[PDB]
Write a protein that binds this ligand. Structure first.
Ligand SMILES: Cc1cc2nc3c(=O)[nH]c(=O)nc-3n(C[C@H](O)[C@H](O)[C@H](O)COP(=O)(O)OP(=O)(O)OC[C@H]3O[C@@H](n4cnc5c(N)ncnc54)[C@H](O)[C@@H]3O)c2cc1C
Ligand SMILES: Cc1cc2nc3c(=O)[nH]c(=O)nc-3n(C[C@H](O)[C@H](O)[C@H](O)COP(=O)(O)OP(=O)(O)OC[C@H]3O[C@@H](n4cnc5c(N)ncnc54)[C@H](O)[C@@H]3O)c2cc1C
Ligand SMILES: NC(=O)c1cc(N2CC2)c([N+](=O)[O-])cc1[N+](=O)[O-]
Ligand SMILES: NC(=O)c1cc(N2CC2)c([N+](=O)[O-])cc1[N+](=O)[O-]
Ligand SMILES: [Zn+2]
Ligand SMILES: [Zn+2]
Lengths: 230, 230
């Protein structure tokens, strides 16, 4: 039996360092025999805004619009917009979701935030109850592959930015773990715009090399202690 | 004399609890004689995606698009899209910026993420050097007014979600502090949807009351210790 991978990719420029890391992931996972799909959010002009257009059916309560409630129900009625349900198919079938993005404001670019907000709806990714370790995507793996402007030392506890692990918490725990994913350790490629040609090559090579044995890695313990120390 | 307030507001439904919190803020700050402006993102259909459309006319390097470089240059050359510069004008003039939003995945809704992404460009909100306490918005105050689905107990260190301060980091430190704002203590309105109508009313009264003395408040210390201590 093989493995299915979805790469959710958020960068405007094919020739960027992010583009290189995404292409390398496709090549290496494809070479392994994996089933691979890429959602290139900017080329898709993916809609990030959570709005009433996300539901192609009778809006249940059209007097007071509640996005959570309307999308939950629309999920059950199979009446979500097709951009959403197309992504949900991709996610439903994946054994591994990789997110490839440059860090914007200690988080994901908005187009990618919008993918999280609209795709990962109640009924689909979680239920109440049915989250964290009972999240509806248990059994899947997830991996953040992030590039920064800041260097590694800036992202240490004694540095100006604090530990890079600090900003991971809403993504790794708040989102991914919440939906039931097991989380592989993040790939962080620090400061590529500042690095030499060779350092950049080494970072891209370190990532393809990691992907070779990706199916053998254990998930991190996705806890407050992993992220915060103490 | 006076002060000016910008409320950056991210909720699709005026009749929502978020809508009431926004309306009470406008009411009360207004009554005080403040100048008040609301950027109602969803009603503006505000563009969240960071794209080459954000630069007017001809790019500095159209072969390889770098969003950061291009927006930094367009800022100096006064060629940023008018939707961005319209917001920058509001922020420039503000003494206090209030963010009013529902928590979406331990962060801001994507439409508001894209506000941050596209509005707070280099040259305007920060430079290098010129960030953290030297950020270019220094002397300004910022405050997150956030509503949750989860209860206050869920957002303790021993609750399922972890302390609320953990998720504030990318916003308060990574973004607001980084641009030089001083950050007032967040206003967190826990689980309104679950509350009685009377409880909801009490939380709107509490927000109004706090705003009566907002100008008397001191900033939090925006450190890793505040967020992850103790
Ligand atoms: C809105 C905004 C907010 C930001 N917020 C933050 C923040 O909170 N924290 C932070 O740390 N940073 C922040 N940044 C910076 C951003 O994270 C970095 O600029 C980004 O991660 C760099 O990735 P890139 O793919 O765009 O690099 P690129 O600019 O594309 O370039 C890296 C270099 O490597 C070259 N390259 C491409 N492919 C290869 C390859 N295969 N082999 C060798 N070289 C290659 C490229 O041509 C280029 O010269 C922010 C930037 C923006 C625009
Ligand atoms: C995509 C997505 C991701 C989410 N992620 C998270 C997460 O990470 N963590 C989390 O905790 N939550 C999360 N949530 C939940 C979200 O934070 C809450 O649903 C939201 O904060 C509730 O605020 P509201 O304004 O929308 O409530 P409302 O639905 O508007 O409900 C409150 C009630 O108050 C009523 N009301 C309005 N004004 C008044 C007034 N003046 N007096 C009395 N009653 C009034 C309204 O009629 C309504 O019935 C997420 C939701 C979505 C859709
Ligand atoms: N590496 C950095 O010094 C850096 C660079 C940028 N810049 C160039 C886009 C941003 N940022 O925009 O938020 C933030 C940081 N930071 O470390 O927090
Ligand atoms: N009150 C909650 O239990 C709750 C509800 C939602 N809901 C309404 C969509 C989300 N969330 O979306 O991630 C998160 C939580 N949470 O505590 O982490
Ligand atoms: Zn976790
Ligand atoms: Zn800080």
């Amino acid at each position: 039996a093989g493995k299915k991978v979805l790469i959710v990719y958020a960068h405007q420029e094919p020739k960027s360092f992010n583009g290189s890391l995404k292409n390398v992931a496709v090549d290496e996972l494809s070479r392994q025999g994996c089933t691979v799909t890429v959602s290139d959010l900017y080329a898709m002009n993916f809609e990030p805004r959570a709005t009433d257009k996300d539901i192609t059916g009778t809006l249940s309560n059209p007097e007071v619009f509640n996005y959570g409630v309307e999308t939950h129900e629309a999920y059950k009625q199979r009446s979500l917009a097709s951009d959403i349900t197309d992504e949900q198919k991709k996610v439903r079938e994946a054994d591994l979701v990789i997110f490839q993005f440059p860090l914007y404001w200690f988080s994901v670019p908005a187009i990618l935030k919008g993918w999280m907000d609209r795709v990962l709806c109640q009924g689909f990714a979680f239920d109440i109850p049915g989250f964290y370790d009972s999240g509806l995507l248990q059994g899947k793996l997830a991996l953040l592959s992030v590039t920064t402007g800041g260097t590694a030392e800036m992202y240490t506890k004694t540095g100006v930015n604090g530990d890079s692990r600090y900003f991971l918490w809403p993504l790794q725990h708040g989102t991914l773990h919440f939906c039931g994913f097991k989380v592989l350790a993040p790939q962080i490629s620090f400061a590529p715009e500042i690095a030499s040609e060779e350092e950049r090559k080494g970072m891209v090579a370190a990532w393809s090399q990691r992907l070779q044995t990706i199916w053998k890695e254990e998930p991190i313990p996705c806890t407050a202690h992993w992220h915060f120390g103490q």
